[PDB]
């Protein structure tokens, strides 16, 4: 079996793809890595061989966060029953709460609009408030409450989360994962994940309060209550993943996976609306013709707003916030584009190469909403639209994220006209790579309509 050819990062991989093709390999430290580029490669790996590519590479430092065999959360959980039980529970719970989450999102959108209006037309960076609105949607899903935009514990929670994102990058974490033995030195153990650990600690305090107000004689109001109820039925069952050590991990996974993604996406959205005011006006025209100017947007509006739906999809395509997705690990030998992938290889899915594929999209490096329209103005979704990846491990947040993007974006453009402040440089459309790819900082003016 022949192996893939091969010898900041997103540009580098797209460079190597040019040189060695769509499936190439690397040795990143002591990890054999295979990178997949383009729709064909990614689907072959994640769908056709989806059974064998749905594992995660082990992360030894998660011991520090209370992880264990039946306590792996969902995002990093190894392929196996502790992942599948929590995967199915979150997917189902999200779905059940639809029957609601939309009500929580819609209320949050009105809170956000009111917070935007308080800037009375003066320039401001939108990011802070977008984070808060998006964080309160997760708060609503997980604990059945929101927090005020100036609640002290709410702000510390978001602060801890931002600092915890940074801890995903570093020399220290790379060494400790390589040799988990170094974790016996307390000086090192206490430093690796101090912000993520502090987040969980702050979270415990919220979960303890929620556990006091839970009414178990009523149907669960939110996901923590659904979990607690499952935890009751599972007392006496050492096989269950429904336990107090997993609860805090699963809820931390939903916050930390769901905040920065949806928020960054919305930040790209507003930036592209001030760089392309003509798209903005067309969206505001479609809003006026379908929704009007008083009534709050509802999810039922989306099927009648093909242009707004195109724009929101193009924001995700152009924004391309998670260029390299989330790593997978193979649990069996597989074949991709002919090449042999050994068991235990880390797979990197180059989602950027799918979203920006020049063979598929008309002008992939332009902001071009017609990427999702046909000449008639019908919304069409190409198969290369994979901002959430594919297969068994594809973003379980996707239905909620879709709801948030549509209800936050259209609520905002319903009530405000957005522009570049009249004395500043046209902000760049080029992102800042980090954990996520986010817009380079900008301010905007939001004036009522
Ligand atoms: C625009 C917003 C979002 C984007 C672009 C996004 C993107 C992604 C991607 C690329 C993955 C990796 C799939 C893979 O492993 O191949 C992922 C996984 C995941 N996402 Fe999202 N995400 C978004 C919002 C959310 C939200 C709102 C939540 C929670 C409600 C969420 C929760 C998760 C979880 C738990 C996983 C792990 C799934 C698993 O391992 O089974 N995400 N997301
Ligand atoms: C590729 C990164 C993924 C790994 N975790 C699950 C989803 C994302 C982010 C998150 C973690 O980095 C993280 C970031 C920020 N604050 C956190 C707070 C607690 C936490 O508990 C597991 C994990 C956190
Ligand atoms: Zn509750
Ligand atoms: Zn058509």
From Swiss-Prot:
Example of a GO biological process term: alkaloid metabolic process
Cofactor(s) required, per the database record: heme
Pathway assignment: Cofactor metabolism; retinol metabolism; Lipid metabolism; fatty acid metabolism; Steroid metabolism; cholesterol metabolism
GO molecular function, one term: iron ion binding
Name this polypeptide is given: Cytochrome P450 2D6
Subcellular location: Endoplasmic reticulum membrane; Microsome membrane
Recorded GO CC terms: cytoplasm; endoplasmic reticulum; endoplasmic reticulum membrane; intracellular membrane-bounded organelle; mitochondrion
Effect of residue 276 to P: In allele CYP2D6*7; loss of activity
Species assigned in the record: Homo sapiens
